[PDB]
Swiss-Prot record:
Task performed by this protein: Phosphatidylinositol (PtdIns) phosphatase that specifically hydrolyzes the 5-phosphate of phosphatidylinositol-3,4,5-trisphosphate (PtdIns(3,4,5)P3) to produce PtdIns(3,4)P2, thereby negatively regulating the PI3K (phosphoinositide 3-kinase) pathways. Able also to hydrolyzes the 5-phosphate of phosphatidylinositol-4,5-bisphosphate (PtdIns(4,5)P3) and inositol 1,3,4,5-tetrakisphosphate. Acts as a negative regulator of B-cell antigen receptor signaling.
Tissue: Specifically expressed in immune and hematopoietic cells. Expressed in bone marrow and blood cells. Levels vary considerably within this compartment. Present in at least 74% of immature CD34+ cells, whereas within the more mature population of CD33+ cells, it is present in only 10% of cells. Present in the majority of T-cells, while it is present in a minority of B-cells (at protein level).
Post-translational modification: Tyrosine phosphorylated by the members of the SRC family after exposure to a diverse array of extracellular stimuli such as cytokines, growth factors, antibodies, chemokines, integrin ligands and hypertonic and oxidative stress. Phosphorylated upon IgG receptor FCGR2B-binding.
The protein's name in its UniProt record: Phosphatidylinositol 3,4,5-trisphosphate 5-phosphatase 1
Outcome of mutating residue 288 to E: In one patient with acute myeloid leukemya; somatic mutation
Organism of this sequence: Homo sapiens (Human)
Family named by the database record: Belongs to the inositol 1,4,5-trisphosphate 5-phosphatase family.
Localization (cell): Cytoplasm; Cell membrane; Membrane raft; Cytoplasm, Cytoskeleton
Disulfide bonds: none
Record remark on domains: The SH2 domain interacts with tyrosine phosphorylated forms of proteins such as SHC1 or PTPN11/SHP-2. It competes with that of GRB2 for binding to phosphorylated SHC1 to inhibit the Ras pathway. It is also required for tyrosine phosphorylation. The NPXY sequence motif found in many tyrosine-phosphorylated proteins is required for the specific binding of the PID domain.
Domain of life per record: Eukaryota
Subunit structure: Interacts with tyrosine phosphorylated form of SHC1. Interacts with tyrosine phosphorylated form of DOK1. Interacts with tyrosine phosphorylated form of DOK3. Interacts with tyrosine phosphorylated form of SLAMF1/CD150. Interacts with PTPN11 in response to IL-3. Interacts with receptor EPOR. Interacts with receptors MS4A2/FCER1B and FCER1G. Interacts with receptors FCGR2B and FCGR3. Interacts with receptor FCGR2A, leading to regulate gene expression during the phagocytic process. Interacts with GRB2. Interacts with PLCG1. Interacts with tyrosine kinases SRC and TEC. Interacts with c-Met/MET.
Gene: INPP5D
Amino acid sequence: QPEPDMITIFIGTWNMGNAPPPKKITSWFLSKGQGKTRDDSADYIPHDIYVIGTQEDPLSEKEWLEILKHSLQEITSVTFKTVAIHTLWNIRIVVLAKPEHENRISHICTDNVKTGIANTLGNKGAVGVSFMFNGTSLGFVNSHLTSGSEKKLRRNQNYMNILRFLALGDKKLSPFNITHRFTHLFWFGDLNYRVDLPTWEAETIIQKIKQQQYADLLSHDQLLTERREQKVFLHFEEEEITFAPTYRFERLTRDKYAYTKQKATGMKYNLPSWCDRVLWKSYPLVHVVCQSYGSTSDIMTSDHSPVFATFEAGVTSQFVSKNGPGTVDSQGQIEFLRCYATLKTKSQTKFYLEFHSSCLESFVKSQEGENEEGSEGELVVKFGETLPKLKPIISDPEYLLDQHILISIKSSDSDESYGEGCIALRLEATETQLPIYTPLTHHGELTGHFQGEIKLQTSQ
Ligand SMILES: NC(=O)c1cnc(C(F)(F)F)nc1
């Protein structure tokens, strides 16, 4: 049985509004309703992995697992295996996989982050799951962020706390947060960003939704605007939104948005909004295609509609050669020429680089670079030709060209990372000097750039 080079992943996010689900929720798992929907011809084809994020979930883990597994069995006639389940308050993530993938899945991690302090600590935060699928690392984050149209800054702060403190993936990757630890990272949930228009425009907004005219609404979506100003979800992708706002509905219909201020809303307006979202971030030059992004029309127990997204995701096999793992393969090497980091820091310390990759026996520290002043005030750290030669465990190009090198630039004085990035080895050529580039981030904020040239030697 050959190992796959591609899998399909279902991501679901549903804020259940503290109400039990209806007896049938199969439309969710089938990507049927509004938006970018899945072809009917695919309905019996199971996804490899189903990742279900809920918010305001009133069910026990047991109650929800029974509904999920029974749903997927009805659709696919497959009995899914439970990879992981993790609940923080009423925020829950479930990972289910086809039984044939049990042997391919390892290193399962779960974690949660609680957001806010005193007042604002009590029900918002995130749960997450990571694991290895053969040679590919997968992360999944389900977050319920701060509510309310006038709290987009709080949401951005909640996001930064989650990406700093959620402890998933390989703990040896100590300079890197979840935004660098995975081949593919999926981040979804009730992110609670709103359509920022005047309250008086509520009926105009509803009119526009009834006409399926979303363009003037999406231009005021806080998540799109904050992302375009690099305030949140830097370097993440989201599929175009072609479904109606998923909040806030009157329960037991979808014919009505309930937007008016009420005691139950803290006298806040809830203008129709895309609260419920799916974003992703994959390493450079890995295959990832969104094949659906939409909302269900027939599940009406909550004031939110469920959202689905499906993805084709590139995966690699767990490679073994006569040499590595357990030693290096001297027919392989990674060299770096004309390299320099540009940092936004106003500080003056020396810096060195750390290279981390599962193609190395362990991480590699460089010599200190030479600091120079850039023409526009920037700190430029010159490595020139001084970076070490990296020694991969396996030289076969069918392995090595599928790998990535994570880079941290660290202060010599504190050993603290000032910036993290990632370089793909999926080069246009081997044994050839080729430009490389990555932005550098720290706590998910842009801190600089790393650029230079690479020269990769494989066994071919
Ligand atoms: N390595 C594991 O502990 C593992 C457990 N369970 C599964 C499941 F749920 F797919 F069957 N896959 C892997």
